[PDB]
Design a protein around this ligand. Structure first.
Ligand SMILES: Nc1nc2c(ncn2[C@@H]2O[C@H](COP(=O)(O)OP(=O)(O)OP(=O)(O)O)[C@@H](O)[C@H]2O)c(=O)[nH]1
Ligand code: SF4
Ligand SMILES: [Zn+2]
Ligand SMILES: [Zn+2]
Ligand SMILES: [Zn+2]
Lengths: 512, 97, 158, 495, 86, 39
RNA sequence: UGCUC
DNA sequence: TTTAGTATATGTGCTGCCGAATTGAGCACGGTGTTTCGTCCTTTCCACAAG
DNA sequence: CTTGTGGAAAGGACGAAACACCGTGCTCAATTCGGCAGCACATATACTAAA
C-alpha cells in the first residue's frame, strides 16, 4: 500500500501541516503503537507528538485503545484518510439533496470533525448572516430543523459517547475513558430551547455538552452507490426504469444495512403507491417494467418471491460487479483502443479461451490480436491458467488459456488511481512552488489595493498597479490558474472511479 | 600475480592470518593485508551510503556528504559485485573518535 | 471454408475494411431501429420487441444494401453481430420460437438490439497518469517525475 | 570571499546496512542505458559501441582507453554501473525462496498478512523489544510463517487461500481451486463451469480440467507486492528502510562497471577474451530484443512464454550459474562463472581475495643450515636484500646514514633504490642522475627506500602452518650466499 | 532476427490515445471551487499546526507589533486520554 | 568482529587494538576564558 | 597434468 | 438424555530427494581460445577460338 | 609460340540462428550429513446416533 501511504502523506501535508503528517504516516506504516515509542521513532519533541495525535483524533482519523498494563495504543485509519478526499463530493451531494443550510452544516462537521449541535448551528448562522444582507438575521430554529432532518436521514451521526464515570467503576480514573458507541441515541438530537441571531462579523452552561456529531460517510457512500446504479439503469433502458429503481432504493435504504447480498424484497403495490404522482403510470405498466427488468441479463433486480402480487428484490452486489466491469472495459478501451476492448470483453464473457478462438470470435487478423493480448498481460489485466499435461510444466506441452480476474484487476486499477491522484497532487504542488515568487508578487500588488480600500482611498493608486512588470506575467498567472483548476478537476473526477472500485472490493469480501 | 614466471608475490593464506590473529599483532596484519597488498582510497556518500567517484555522488547528485575512506580493493570489488546482485551494502560512516 | 476461402478472406488477405463497414452498417441499422422503437412509445414490451432485430432480418437488410459482391450467409451476419456484442454496443437475447421466417435454430431465435453503454468514460482515463505507458517507472525523484512530465504538460497546455 | 569546506575527515565505517534497491533507485544509480547487444563496432578499430555493452562510460578495462564518465585512467577509475530494462519481469533466484515465503505469508486477494488483530499486536510487541538479533528475527519469521500457514481463510476480505508451492523451475503454483472431497464450495464449482467455451472449442480442456490451479507469474506477483500495506511489511521481518516487497521481483538489471568485467585484447587473432558476465548480459539483451520482436509481430502465447522462461533461466544463471532444477533441453552447454561462483569457492573473493591475499615486498627461497647465527637471527642473501626495500623517514638521527646510503646507490648493497620527496610525491630513481646532489638535498620528512640491512625485523614463515610458531619475526643479517639460513634449534617450530 | 538499436528508447514514448476530456457542468465547477475554498480555509484553521519557528536573531520593540496572534482550540480532555495534556 | 575488521581493512579489536593510547603533552585542560565585556 | 615440501 | 461409534484434525513422527562441504601453498609447461553452416560477393585463373 | 573476352570456380565476408548431421539419451552416482517436505497415518477429541 505504498501508493496509499503516499496519498495519505500528501493529503495530510496539504491539509494539516508537516509535524502532524509525519506522525500520521508513521502510524499508517507501523500501525498501533504507544505514544512514547512513536515519539522516539519520529524524532521530534513530545509536545508536538501530543498535538499531532490530538488534532488527528479530533477528525476521527486515529483511534486509541487500551491493552495490558493499562497502556494506550494509537492506530490510524488509512480508509478515513482516503475518504477525506471525498469532502467536495459530500458537500456537493448534501447541497443538491438539501438547502445551503445543510451544506454549511456538513462543511463545518467535516472541517472540525467533532462538534456539538449548538456550536455547529451557531457557526452555520454566523456564516449565513454574511450571505444575506439588509439587516435580516438568521435564527436557530430553521438551522436545528435542517440538522434534525439530516439526522433522521442518517447523514449525520453522534460520535461515541464516553460512559458515565460515576456509574461505571467509580474510583481511580483509567488512562483512557474507553469511549463506547450506542445505537439507541445514535441519531437522537438533544432538545435545545435556546435560540439566537448570528453576528455579521462586526468585531466590535452548554446544554448539549459532551454530545458530539460527525458526518456519516457510510450514508454518503450508500447514496453515491444508489445514484450510480440509477444513472446506469437510466443509460441502459430508460429514465422510467431509473425512477422506479430510485424509488425502490429509497424504500430499501431504511429497512437495510450498508452491506448485504440482497435487500428486503418489495411488492408491486407498495412501489406503485410510493412512486411520485408526477408520472402517469398504471399498475400494469409497473408490472411490465419490473418483469422486463427481472429478465435483464445484467441482473439488476430479481423476483425472489411471488406473494403480494409482484414481489421483487434488488441485487446490489451484482450491480456493483456490473459497474466494476463497465469501468474496467471503459479504461481498457480508452487505453488500448476499441479493438483491445473487444478482445477484453470476448475473453471476459468466455471464461477461458485461447488465441485461435479469440481470433475466430473477434475477427481480428493475426499479428495484432496476440499483440494486444500480450500488452494486457504485461499490465496485469488478465492471468493465464496454464493447464499442464505433465507436472513438469514445460511450455511446449501445455495449453495456455486467457482469463480475466475481476477482483485482482479491480485492485490493480484502484492502486493505479491512487498513484495517479498522488502524481497529480505532486504536480500541483510543484507548479505552486516553482511559481511562488510570482504568486507573492501578485498577492502584494493586489494587497496594495486591498489595503486602505475606503479609509484614505485615493484614486491615484489605481493606475499604478498594472504599471509594474506584473502585466506580462499575468499570462503566466492565468496559465498556472487554469492548470491548477484542471488538475483539481481531474483529481475530483478520478475520485468517482476510486469510490466505485473501493465499493466493489469491499462488497466482495466476507471479513470472516 | 601468482607465479614467479609472472613476477608474482607470496600469499598470506588463511593459516597465516590465523597465526597473526593468535599473536595479536593487529597493526602488522593490517599493514600486510590492507596497506601493502590492495590499499585504495574510495569516496563514500554519507547520505545514501553508496560509493562515489572523484568526490561526487551520482545517486544524490551532491558532493557535500561525500568523504574519502581507506579500503582494500578486494572489499570494494565485493561491494560492487553485491550491488550488481541487488544486495546493496549501505555504509554509514562516522568520525574515528 | 475453414482451410481456404471464406467471405472475409480475399486472396489470402483479411479484409479489415470490409468487416469494419459491415459493423458500422449493422450498428447504424440497429441504432435506427432502437430510435424508432423509443419514439413509438406505444408500450414498454412492444418497444423492446420492436427494438429487437432478428439475425435473418439484418441479414436480408445487408443483402439489400449490397456493399460487397461476395454472398454473405446468415451465420456470417451472426458472427458480425457477435463481434459487435463483444464491442459493448449491442445486446442479444435468445427467445423461444418454434418456426417462422428464420427457421435457423430449433425452437430458438436470436434477437439483437442497440443498447447504450453502462456508464460514461471513467475518471481515471481523463488523467494522463491512467493512460501512461511508462506508468510503472514513475517516481518522485528521477528522470521520470510528475514535476517534469511531458504528458501532463501537453495535457494542461491543450 | 572564500567558503569554509573541510578537506578530509578521518571517517571510520561504523556498520554495513544491507538492503535492496527498487527499479527507480536502479535507474537513479545508473548513468547510461545499455540497449545494444553487440560489443564492438564494424570498423577495423573495433571500438566499443555507444549505449551498448563494454561502453567506456561505465568504467574502463584497458590501460590506453580512459573512462568517459570521469577523466581518469584505469588505476584511478572506480567504475560506474548501468541499468538494463527488461520487457517482462523475472523472479530473482536469490530472493525466490523469500518470494515464496512472502506469498505464503500474505493473502493472494487483498495482499494482507494472514494474522488476526491479536496476533498482529502480539508480534508487534515482541518485535519492538530492543536488541533484536538475527537468530531471533529468523525464529520470529519461522513462527509467523507457521501460524499463517495454519490458517486457510482470510479475516480481512474472506477470500480462500490454499497452499502455495514451487512447481518446475522458477514457477509458483497457488492451489486456490483445490479438490474438496466433502460438499464443494460455490467458488470452485463456478471456476470449473466457467470453462464451457474452452471445452466447446477444445475438448482436451475437459479431461485436463483438474489440477488447474493459479499460476503466479512474475507479473501477478509484482502487482500483488506493489499493493501490500506498509503496516504489514514489518510483520514480514523485512526492514522497511532496507527495501520493499516489490523489490524482490526484478525488472531492471544492474550491469557492473568494466573493472569487474576485464577484457583482454588479443591482437594475435581476430578476437578478444571476455568474462562470462558480459556474454550473459549480451544474451539477456538479445532475449529482450527477441521478446519485443515477437510481441510486435504477434507470436503465439506458447513461444512467448517459452522465451519468458528462457529469459528467467538466463537471468538466474547470470546471478547463480549453478542450479539443480534446470531442464535437460534447457541445460547450458558449457560452464559459466556467475556471481555466486565468483563469491563462493576456494578461489572466491572471501577466501581468495579477502581472508588470504597476495602481498608484495616478500620472497620465497630454499633454506640451509647455519649454526653460527643466533636463534633470533636469520640470514638473507644479498640478491634478495637489494630487491626488498624498506621506507625509512629522514629524521634528525639517521640523516647521515641515509645520505651515505643514497651516495652508495642501488648497485652497492648498503643503499637505497628510490627517494620520495616530502613536498611532492614524485619518486626519483637513484640509478639515474647525480646521487650526490640528491644526498645533499635530503630534507627532513622524506622517504628513502633503503635496502634490507642488518638489524631489520623480518618475518620468516613456512607455508604449511599448523600453529602460530610456524611464523616468527627474526633479525635479518645479509650474507653473500643465495639461501635463507637460520639456527637449526628453530627447526622444530617450523618443522 | 531482431535489429540492433543504437540509441535507447525515448524516456517518454508517444501514444496515439489521449486522455478523455473532463466532464463539464455546474456541478464539477462548483466542486472545484469548493475544494479550492477548503484548501484556502483549512490552512488558517487552528487544526493546521505549523512548524514552530525557532532561533530568533534578537528581541525588538516591534515584536509586540509583529507578534502572530491566533485563537487556539481547546481539546476535550474528557474523551482524550491524560497523556496528551500539556 | 575480527573477520569483518580484516575485510574492511581496519585494526581488529582483539590484540593490541583493544585499548587506546593517549599522548602526555604539556597542556592545561579547561584553559582560562577571556571575559566578555559587553555581556 | 606433472611436480616440490 | 447419555454412552458408543464415526470422522476429522492436526501433530507428530518416520523417510527420501536436496544442497553443501572435502589442507596449505610454490613451481614448471601444452592447449586452446566461439563458430560455423550455408549464401553471396569478388577476384582469379584457365576450356577454347584467335593472332 | 603469345593473346583475349567471357565463364566457372574458389575463397572470404556475412547474417539467420543457436553451437549435436537426426532431434536422444547415456552413466555414475565420489562420501557423508544436516536441513527439508511428503505422506501417512494415528490417535484422540468431538459430535451425531441408538437405546
Ligand atoms: N598443463 C596443465 N593442465 C591443467 C592445468 N589446470 C588444469 N589442467 C588439466 O585439466 C584438468 C582439470 O581442469 P581444471 O583445472 O578444472 O580447469 P579450470 O581451472 O576449470 O580452467 P580455468 O578455469 O580456465 O583455469 C586436469 O585433469 C588437469 O590435467 C594447468 O594449469 N596446466
Ligand atoms: S510521466 Fe507524468 S503524466 Fe506520465 S505517468 Fe508519470 S507522472 Fe503521470
Ligand atoms: Zn548519495
Ligand atoms: Zn569511471
Ligand atoms: Zn485476503
Amino acid at each position: 500500500t505504498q501508493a496509499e501511504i503516499k496519498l495519505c502523506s500528501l493529503l495530510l501535508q496539504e491539509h494539516f501541516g508537516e509535524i502532524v503528517e509525519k506522525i500520521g504516516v508513521h502510524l499508517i506504516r507501523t500501525g498501533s503503537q504507544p505514544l512514547r515509542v512513536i515519539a522516539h521513532d519520529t524524532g521530534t519533541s513530545l509536545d508536538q507528538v501530543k498535538k499531532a495525535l490530538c488534532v488527528l483524533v479530533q477528525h476521527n482519523l486515529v483511534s486509541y485503545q487500551v491493552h495490558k498494563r493499562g497502556v494506550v495504543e494509537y492506530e490510524a485509519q488509512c480508509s478515513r484518510v482516503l475518504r477525506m478526499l471525498r469532502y467536495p463530493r459530500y458537500i456537493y451531494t448534501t447541497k443538491t439533496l438539501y438547502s445551503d443550510t445543510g451544506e454549511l452544516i456538513v462543511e463545518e462537521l467535516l472541517l472540525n470533525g467533532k462538534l456539538t449541535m449548538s456550536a455547529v448551528v451557531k457557526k452555520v448562522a454566523d456564516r449565513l448572516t454574511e450571505t444575506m444582507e439588509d439587516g435580516k438575521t438568521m435564527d436557530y430554529a430553521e438551522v436545528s430543523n435542517t440538522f434534525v432532518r439530516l439526522a433522521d436521514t442518517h447523514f449525520v451521526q453522534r460520535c461515541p459517547s464516553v460512559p458515565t464515570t460515576e456509574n461505571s467503576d467509580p474510583g481511580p480514573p483509567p488512562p483512557a475513558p474507553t469511549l463506547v458507541i450506542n445505537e439507541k441515541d445514535m441519531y437522537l438530537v438533544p432538545k435545545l430551547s435556546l435560540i439566537g441571531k448570528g453576528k455579521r462579523r462586526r468585531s466590535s452552561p452548554i446544554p448539549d455538552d459532551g454530545i458530539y456529531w460527525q458526518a456519516n460517510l457510510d450514508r454518503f457512500h450508500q447514496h453515491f452507490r444508489d445514484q450510480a446504479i440509477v444513472s446506469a439503469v437510466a443509460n441502459r433502458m430508460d429514465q422510467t426504469s431509473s425512477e422506479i429503481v430510485r424509488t425502490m432504493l429509497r424504500m430499501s435504504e431504511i429497512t437495510t444495512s450498508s452491506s448485504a447480498p440482497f435487500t428486503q424484497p418489495l411488492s408491486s403495490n407498495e412501489i406503485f403507491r410510493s412512486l411520485p404522482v408526477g408520472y402517469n403510470i398504471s399498475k400494469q405498466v409497473l408490472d411490465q417494467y419490473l418483469t422486463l427488468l427481472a429478465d435483464d441479463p445484467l441482473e439488476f433486480v430479481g423476483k425472489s418471491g411471488d406473494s403480494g402480487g409482484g414481489m421483487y428484490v434488488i441485487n446490489l452486489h451484482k450491480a456493483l460487479a456490473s459497474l466494476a466491469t463497465a469501468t474496467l472495459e471503459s479504461v481498457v478501451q480508452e487505453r488500448f483502443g476499441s479493438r483491445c476492448a473487444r478482445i477484453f470483453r470476448l475473453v471476459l464473457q468466455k471464461k477461458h479461451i485461447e488465441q485461435k478462438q479469440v481470433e475466430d470470435f473477434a475477427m481480428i487478423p493475426a499479428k495484432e490480436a496476440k499483440d494486444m493480448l500480450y500488452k494486457m498481460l504485461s499490465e496485469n489485466f488478465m492471468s493465464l491458467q496454464e493447464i499442464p499435461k505433465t507436472p513438469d510444466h514445460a511450455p511446449s506441452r501445455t495449453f495456455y488459456l486467457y482469463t480475466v480476474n475481476i477482483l485482482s484487476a479491480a485492485r490493480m486499477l484502484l492502486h493505479r488511481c491512487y498513484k495517479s491522484i498522488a502524481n497529480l497532487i505532486e504536480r500541483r504542488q510543484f507548479e505552486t512552488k516553482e511559481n511562488k515568487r510570482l504568486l507573492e508578487k501578485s498577492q502584494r500588488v493586489e494587497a496594495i489595493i486591498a489595503s486602505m480600500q475606503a479609509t484614505g482611498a485615493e484614486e491615484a493608486q489605481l493606475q499604478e498597479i498594472e504599471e509594474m512588470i506584473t502585466a506580462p506575467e499575468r499570462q503566466q498567472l492565468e496559465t498556472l490558474k487554469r492548470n491548477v483548476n484542471k488538475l483539481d478537476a481531474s483529481e475530483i473526477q478520478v475520485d468517482e472511479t476510486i469510490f466505485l472500485l473501493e465499493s466493489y472490493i469491499e462488497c466482495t469480501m466476507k471479513r470472516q | 600475480t601468482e607465479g614467479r614466471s609472472r613476477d608474482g608475490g607470496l600469499r598470506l593464506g588463511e593459516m597465516e592470518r590465523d597465526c597473526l590473529i593468535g599473536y595479536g599483532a593487529s597493526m602488522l596484519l593490517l599493514e600486510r593485508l590492507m596497506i601493502s597488498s590492495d590499499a585504495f582510497e574510495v569516496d563514500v556518500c554519507g547520505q545514501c551510503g553508496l560509493l562515489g567517484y572523484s568526490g561526487w555522488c551520482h545517486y544524490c547528485k551532491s558532493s557535500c556528504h561525500v568523504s574519502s575512506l581507506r579500503i582494500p580493493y578486494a572489499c570494494k570489488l565485493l561491494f560492487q559485485e553485491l550491488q550488481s546482485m541487488n544486495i546493496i551494502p549501505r555504509l554509514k560512516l562516522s568520525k574515528y573518535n | 471454408r475453414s482451410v481456404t476461402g471464406g467471405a472475409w478472406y480475399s486472396d489470402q488477405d483479411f479484409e479489415s475494411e470490409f468487416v469494419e463497414v459491415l459493423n458500422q452498417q449493422c450498428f447504424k441499422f440497429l441504432q435506427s431501429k432502437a430510435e424508432t422503437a423509443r419514439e413509438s412509445k406505444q408500450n414498454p414490451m412492444i418497444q423492446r420487441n420492436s427494438s429487437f432485430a432478428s439475425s435473418h432480418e439484418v441479414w436480408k437488410y445487408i443483402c439489400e444494401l449490397g456493399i460487397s459482391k461476395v454472398e454473405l450467409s446468415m451465420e456470417d451476419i451472426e458472427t458480425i453481430l457477435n463481434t459487435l456484442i463483444y464491442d459493448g454496443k449491442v445486446e442479444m437475447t435468445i427467445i423461444a420460437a418454434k418456426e417462422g421466417t428464420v427457421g435457423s435454430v430449433d425452437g430458438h431465435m436470436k434477437l439483437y438490439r442497440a443498447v447504450n453503454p453502462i456508464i460514461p468514460p471513467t475518471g481515471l482515463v481523463r488523467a494522463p497518469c491512467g493512460l501512461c505507458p511508462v506508468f510503472d517507472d514513475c517516481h518522485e525523484g528521477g528522470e521520470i517525475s510528475p514535476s517534469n512530465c511531458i504528458y501532463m504538460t501537453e495535457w494542461l497546455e491543450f | 570571499k572564500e567558503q569554509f569546506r573541510e578537506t578530509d575527515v578521518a571517517k571510520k565505517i561504523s556498520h554495513i546496512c544491507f538492503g535492496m534497491k527498487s527499479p527507480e533507485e536502479m535507474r537513479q544509480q545508473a548513468h547510461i542505458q545499455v540497449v545494444s547487444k553487440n560489443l564492438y563496432s564494424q570498423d577495423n578499430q573495433h571500438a566499443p559501441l555507444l549505449y551498448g555493452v563494454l561502453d567506456h562510460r561505465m568504467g574502463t578495462s584497458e590501460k590506453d582507453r580512459p573512462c568517459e564518465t570521469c577523466g581518469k585512467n584505469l588505476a584511478d577509475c572506480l567504475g560506474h554501473y548501468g541499468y538494463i530494462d527488461l520487457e517482462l519481469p523475472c523472479f530473482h533466484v536469490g530472493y525466490f525462496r523469500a518470494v515464496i515465503g512472502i506469498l505464503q505469508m500474505i493473502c493472494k486477494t487483498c495482499c494482507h498478512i494472514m494474522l488476526s488483530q491479536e496476533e498482529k499486536k502480539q508480534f508487534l510487541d515482541y518485535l519492538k523489544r530492543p536488541g533484536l538479533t538475527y537468530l531471533q528475527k529468523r525464529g520470529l519469521k519461522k513462527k509467523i510463517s507457521d501460524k499463517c500457514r495454519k490458517k486457510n481463510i482470510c479475516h480481512h476480505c474472506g477470500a480462500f487461500n490454499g497452499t502455495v508451492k514451487k512447481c518446475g523451475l522458477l514457477k509458483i503454483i497457488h492451489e486456490k481451486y483445490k479438490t474438496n472431497k466433502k460438499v464443494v464450495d460455490p467458488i470452485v464449482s463456478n471456476f470449473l463451469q466457467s470453462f464451457e467455451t474452452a471445452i466447446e472449442h477444445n475438448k482436451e480442456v475437459e479431461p485436463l480440467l483438474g489440477r488447474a490451479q493459479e499460476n503466479l507469474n512474475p507479473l501477478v506477483v509484482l502487482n500483488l507486492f506493489k499493493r501490500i500495506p506498509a503496516e504489514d511489511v514489518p510483520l514480514l521481518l523485512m526492514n522497511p528502510e532496507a527495501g520493499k516487497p516489490s523489490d524482490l521481483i526484478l525488472t531492471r538489471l544492474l550491469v557492473p562497471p568494466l573493472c569487474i568485467r576485464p577484457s583482454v585484447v588479443s591482437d594475435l587473432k581476430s578476437g578478444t577474451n571476455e568474462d562470462d558476465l558480459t556474454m550473459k548480459l549480451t544474451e539477456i539483451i538479445f532475449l529482450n530484443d527477441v521478446i519485443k520482436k515477437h510481441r510486435i509481430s504477434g507470436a503465439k502465447t506458447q513461444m512467448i512464454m517459452e522465451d519468458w522462461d528462457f529469459l528467467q533461466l538466463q537471468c538466474a544463471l547470470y546471478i547463480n550459474s549453478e542450479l539443480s532444477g534446470i531442464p535437460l533441453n534447457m541445460a547450458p552447454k558449457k560452464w559459466t562463472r556467475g556471481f555466486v561462483q565468483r563469491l563462493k569457492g576456494k578461489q572466491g573473493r572471501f577466501r581468495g581475495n579477502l581472508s588470504g591475499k597476495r602481498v608484495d615486498f616478500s620472497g620465497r627461497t630454499v633454506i640451509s643450515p647455519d649454526p653460527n647465527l643466533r636463534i633470533d637471527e636469520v640470514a638473507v642473501p644479498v640478491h634478495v636484500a637489494k630487491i626488498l626495500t624498506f621506507p625509512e623517514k629522514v629524521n634528525k638521527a639517521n640523516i647521515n646514514f641515509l645520505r651515505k646510503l643514497v651516495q652508495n646507490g642501488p648497485e652497492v648493497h648498503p643503499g637505497a633504490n628510490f627517494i620520495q620527496q616530502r613536498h611532492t610525491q614524485m619518486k626519483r630513481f637513484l640509478k639515474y642522475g647525480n646521487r650526490e646532489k640528491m644526498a645533499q638535498e635530503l630534507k627532513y620528512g622524506d622517504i628513502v627506500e633503503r635496502h634490507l640491512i642488518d638489524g631489520d625485523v623480518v618475518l620468516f614463515n613456512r607455508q604449511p602452518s599448523l600453529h602460530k610458531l610456524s611464523i616468527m619475526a627474526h633479525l635479518a643479517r645479509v650474507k653473500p650466499h643465495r639461501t635463507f639460513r637460520f639456527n637449526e634449534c628453530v627447526c622444530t617450530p617450523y618443522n | 532476427l531482431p535489429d540492433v538499436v543504437l540509441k535507447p528508447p525515448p524516456l517518454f514514448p508517444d501514444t496515439d490515445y489521449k486522455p478523455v476530456p473532463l466532464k463539464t457542468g455546474e456541478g464539477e465547477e462548483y466542486m472545484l471551487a469548493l475544494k479550492q475554498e477548503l484548501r484556502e480555509t483549512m490552512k488558517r484553521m487552528p487544526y493546521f499546526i505549523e512548524t514552530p519557528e525557532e532561533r530568533q536573531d534578537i528581541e525588538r520593540y516591534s515584536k509586540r507589533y509583529m507578534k502572530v496572534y491566533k485563537e487556539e482550540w481547546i481539546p476535550d480532555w474528557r474523551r482524550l486520554p491524560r497523556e496528551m495534556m500539556p | 568482529g575480527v573477520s569483518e575488521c580484516i575485510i574492511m581493512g581496519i585494526p581488529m579489536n582483539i590484540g593490541t587494538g583493544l585499548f587506546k593510547l593517549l599522548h602526555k603533552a604539556d597542556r592545561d585542560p579547561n584553559p582560562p576564558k577571556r571575559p566578555l565585556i559587553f555581556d
